[PDB]
């Protein structure tokens, strides 16, 4: 079914560091999902609260 | 105390932390049981039929509020009273609710945000999210201001939003939800013309004070709901009552018996310990324009600089460096030789490997040794990477003290996570002052569990956190324990200088149990466990004392030209005699350096008249 | 441009200067053509048939007001808006009108204060002053403060020969004269419980701002009648806008664009040059004892001492210094060449003779050497003679700085008049800062005509004056003229040591 | 008949300096009469403005 997300547009590829990228269409913005144990708007900071 | 427990607020613009079930957890443990969330209120990625009855208490949000991609039908975010909007999502809006529906078209249903009254800054954006009902008829000019009212972009359209109409007891059919309760409590367009701020009822007789923000319970600065600028023991003042009042009948500054210190939107009797106390009575975190700080008997002030004073750089995320989020090889040409970083230090594994997303070159791993000059760090120190050669933290060799004013994630001032370094090597590190320390996720790093961090901290209440690094039972196997000299007070590493207090004698930094004295070849002497070098002009002793002073005047045993009490390699060869005359001293019957008859004003270099040609 | 001319206001409580014509003729100079009185208001002994035209323009008296022992038809003290009450009379009163009748019982029949709104401090006492009426029924709670209502007493009484009533239209006949124009404007009791300060009209849609002290002209922080506390450019503020604003998010302090240096109940863009600015902009006269006055970058400052602060001597007239008016023989010991006299130097021909009514022994002249090298005096110097053997100002020798904080009579700093001293001296005084220097009453004193005071004080806008001294042709062929080898710079004395 | 001015009570003998002292009956407080060229509460200062 039609979802929000199309694959990362390669305009902002390798956008985040510790996570997988995905581009949503409901605003034309990239918003990636981090790996486990990370935070941040670019999945850059390490989760220290564990 | 009586105050309200605070969260720290998320800062994930649009980001899924793991999966729909892991993300829901990073919400819960972050936003459970708190009332004054201090950074933001992202409620994002909740999925259908996930309980959210813990948002019934957030009574302030000192930052924007993002509700985006939420599929639960009901978000109980009711008791929220004011969104101070210190920082805007999308750099304009301060309450965004956008695209809250899945593929099946069953997205957000109702936002019973009843008691939301005032937004101190910023517009409000809304976007496609059907099943959202009743909010399409709220009155905005009451909630928001008037100038910022030209940026909002609300856009309501729903299909299954068959939600019933709101009860007729409330104006213009304006309502958050359904029932008599959910209907827009008006307090800023029903005011009487003579009123300037908040009110209640068109009666010009029961307005609110000038500083209340939501509402009031009587016109008074003591009966507001939420204060607009400052507050001191239930009083929404506009500026903390200063310390010294002016007396125009005598022109001399009096003393205010109610002088309080303005510390970040509250008036306090005394600033905290690690905070500067300036002259205006306002607690600061970093006060340098031309001047610098210095100790004043337990309370740090920052007096004036005498022209040329030492350098200071700006931290990460402050002033210049804000579009950058680490220290990469385009914002390192600033930390050239500054000895104190006003701010905070990030080292993420983006600088070394570089990245093209923000136009950063791949920083050479050697440029990092510039930071050898850093001594005091105001904020926190976060490290999660290091060049793939170094074995101990080298560039931070002589870090004196970590002030820890602003702490990463709210508790961690020092944080070294996911590193490959045999052992720390931070050897100076006097007095980590506030905030906790986390050193984990390290592959091969073991010594650090030996130090006594209970003494290293500053303000008590701290707590260390050291797990998930190379086991002690594996470093003792390879014998990676510290030098036998170091006292039972810790050892940052295996090199015999990494101790913190040597066994018996110390060479300033390097440890030696028995330095050289009455037996021993190098000429030096001990002084309160410090091996200091006496003047080398003396002769190597074997029986009695060498000396007790740095100068040679105590070199008793000497095999050179003995300058009376002193002893030098040759008797003085250019010292001035009387009345600014150059005089070469000669040797007496004991080879001593002594003067002669004042007759021969050009010195006395001979026995009698054989050195003054007659 | 919107400023108002200012009077200084006398302080001679009940004494009369000379005769009833001279007294009045001095009372014609002081108070002629001015709105605000920066001092006190004494009007006493203006006898009958004398005119009081000028006395209507007075708009505010920043002290107390005394109307006693005068017998005249009326006192057209009409537009007096407010009486601050900074000082007081009898330590409790701010307006007192006592005993306005002579033998003829003609007295004062009408005190027309139509629009006196508020007395900011202290009680008010109308002692027995017959032949006065139409001021015997005003409601006083409207003008006096709340607590000071207990500290007052009215002794109004009159034989009441005529004294008609006024128009019954104005509230409870509480008028100060004839008609409604001369009737009270009571704007503190007829207000709504929704207003806390003054108001105008019973309605709560127009009640005055919480800072205006008399009335209002469209409720706002500006447009008051008289500012109660401070004033910054036609706005009755409560504290001048500071220069540094504590940004409660970044914990720093920001430069405020509207910086206002507080300066004695008015906010000004920059303190006067001879004033020492503290850290947060506010003019002050003498920095606190913890600090020492250091000058840097033009205008002066004051920072903490290096331990043992130098001794400062506060002049007579401030602090505990009111049980004595000049430096009598019970205070000289409290001076040890401070070099930094702060404010006054009150040395009058009254110490040397002593007086018993004030419980003082006669001063001996030998102990006037403590002031041998007083380097700087901030405010002003008041001398009128010496012990008549010393033939020059021998104590004040190394004095150099006269800055002018508390100028005498608001117009004078170096006051040396009425002595018999051949050459005054002052071999080292080179730093007059403000005020005026006056040497006009010495029978035998003929060197002060030579100095070019233009270089004595900067801050152009001052003018000295020298009269009634030995004519230049008198002491020319006498032995007292500027020295021969001396330089064309003036002769503070006859010799080369003072050629400067 | 009401001699509003009576002579200085001699309890304040030479109360003021530069002018005759004289007392009052209705208020019981003296009002010195300063000479010409003198001002002040007890005739202290020389009139410097004049």
Numbering used by the authors:
A (entry chain C), D (entry chain D): 1 to 50
B (entry chain A): 1 to 614
C (entry chain B): 1 to 500
Tell me, in the authors' exact words, what the paper reports:
The epidermal growth factor receptor (EGFR) is a receptor tyrosine kinase that couples the binding of extracellular ligands, such as EGF and transforming growth factor-α (TGF-α), to the initiation of intracellular signaling pathways. The extracellular module of EGFR consists of four domains, denoted Domains I, II, III, and IV. Domain II, which bridges the ligand-binding domains, contains the ‘dimerization arm’, a loop that mediates the principal interaction with the other subunit in an activated dimer. Domains I, II, and III form a compact unit that we refer to as the ligand-binding ‘head’, and Domain IV forms a rigid and elongated ‘leg’ that connects the ligand-binding head to the single transmembrane helix.
We carried out cryo-EM analysis of EGFR bound to TGF-α using the same procedures as before. Compared to the EGFR:EGF complex, the flexible leg in the tips-separated conformation of the EGFR:TGF-α complex is destabilized. The cryo-EM density for the flexible leg is poorly defined, and there is no interpretable density for this leg in the reconstruction of the tips-separated conformation of the EGFR:TGF-α complex. Several key interactions with Domain I of the receptor are different between EGF and TGF-α. As a result, the ligand-binding pocket is slightly compressed when TGF-α is bound. In the simulations of EGFR bound to TGF-α, this angle is slightly smaller, with the mode occurring at ~75°, indicating that the ligand-binding pocket is slightly compressed when EGFR is bound to TGF-α. This compression between Domains I and III causes Domain II to bend in the TGF-α complex relative to its structure in the EGF complex, leading to a small difference in the orientation of the dimerization arm with respect to Domains III and IV. EGF and TGF-α both maintain the same interface between the dimerization arms of the two EGFR subunits in the dimer, but the additional bending of Domain II in the TGF-α complex requires the two Domain IV legs to rotate toward each other. In the tips-separated conformation of the TGF-α complex, this inward motion would cause a steric clash between the two legs if the legs maintained the conformation seen in the EGF complex. The increased disorder in the Domain IV leg when TGF-α is bound appears to be a result of this close contact being avoided. Due to the more compressed ligand-binding pocket in the TGF-α complex, which leads to potential steric clashes between the Domain IV legs, TGF-α is less effective than EGF at stabilizing the Domain IV legs in the tips-separated conformation of the extracellular module.
